[PDB]
Amino acid sequence: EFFWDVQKIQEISNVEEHSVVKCVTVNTSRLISQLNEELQDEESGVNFIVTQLQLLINNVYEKIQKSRSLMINLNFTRLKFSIAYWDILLERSLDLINGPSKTGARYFITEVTPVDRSRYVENNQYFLAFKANQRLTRNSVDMDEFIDFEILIKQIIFDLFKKNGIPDQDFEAILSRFHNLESLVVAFN
């Protein structure tokens, strides 16, 4: 029992440098109809969608195996319910799933719009500027100017001397043999 209509899948390039984004256009008219007619009560409908989401996720990930990090966009033709409920049902489905599809890829649900998403990624000024921003953030050193390393190093030195029982007379000779905390800590360990 499979109520999803999987249509064309396309790779949207240049979204994020360290991930491959594949967009899967899915038709939901069959599943939406079954929700209105077959499962009138709410309780049965929630399990219906969750069990169907597990079918869709496994079948979509399966088509990509035989086809970085894999980001799979489940692009639904119609979202009758709010996307807030879809983000909940997608997490519930992934929690229930055991196997390669849950671990191998990341999934997010969007609604089909006439706007070309491959153009926005390559053209929009703010999208391009932020992708360049977060490319430099992994190695950011912006916080260091607020930190006073000299005060911290002085505290680590005194604690280390206090724990090893070193008297004040030995401070000059020890600090002249070892020039930074890296050498000082390994010397007393």
Binding site: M71, A84, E111, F127, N133, Q134, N180, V185
Partner: protein, 198 residues
């Protein structure tokens, strides 16, 4: 077995309703930290929750960046997993349907989880209960690492395994168990501390 998470001091006043509901769970332990970041909560040593507003995402800052660019980027510098929760109104949903996929592509990153929620507080509470059940952990010179910008949950996990000397030894010898607790910036910060000469 009592799990523990942190709340940012700058964000306590807003998340007071969330805190009241979360703390009715007897097992949950809640500590408050004056963390510099914009995240509302810290789940474990390298996971945070940052709640943002969809209608604000495209607000132009004076320097040309978008409203949440700097805040999100600063969270990625310090956390290995950043959870972004986007509150959206029915007004902005009906007016701009394109915004919802633009945000998911804008924030698209292997270290960023993006979930849309309605504006009501119950949605954020139920997502927090889910985050606590899945990611939260169970549980001295803590001031040296706190002054390095480390979060309280991170300094808790460190001293679960190491003393402050042993943690430096492990970092000096580049032991992956100590290394894989920090981000890149946190590692280079700890190296700068251990390499500055007197």
């Amino acid at each position: 077995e009592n799990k523990c998470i942190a709340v940012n001091e700058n964000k306590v006043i807003e998340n007071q309703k969330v805190i009241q509901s979360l703390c009715k769970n007897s097992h949950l332990d809640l500590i408050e930290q004056s963390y510099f970041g914009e995240c509302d909560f810290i789940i474990n040593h390298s996971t945070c929750v940052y709640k943002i507003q969809a209608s604000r995402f495209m607000q132009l800052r004076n320097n040309g960046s978008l409203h949440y660019d700097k805040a999100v980027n600063d969270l990625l510098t310090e956390f290995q997993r950043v959870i972004i929760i986007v509150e959206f109104s029915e007004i902005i949903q009906d007016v701009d349907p394109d915004l919802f996929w633009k945000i998911k592509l804008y924030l698209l990153n292997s270290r960023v989880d993006v979930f849309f929620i309605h504006e009501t507080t119950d949605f954020f509470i139920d997502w927090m209960k889910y985050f606590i059940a899945r990611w939260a952990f169970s549980y001295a010179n803590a001031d040296i690492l706190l002054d390095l910008g480390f979060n309280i949950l991170l300094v808790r996990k460190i001293f679960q395994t190491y003393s402050l000397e042993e943690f430096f030894m492990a970092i000096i010898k580049e032991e992956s168990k100590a290394v894989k607790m920090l981000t890149v910036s946190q590692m280079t910060r700890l190296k700068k501390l251990l390499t500055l000469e007197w």
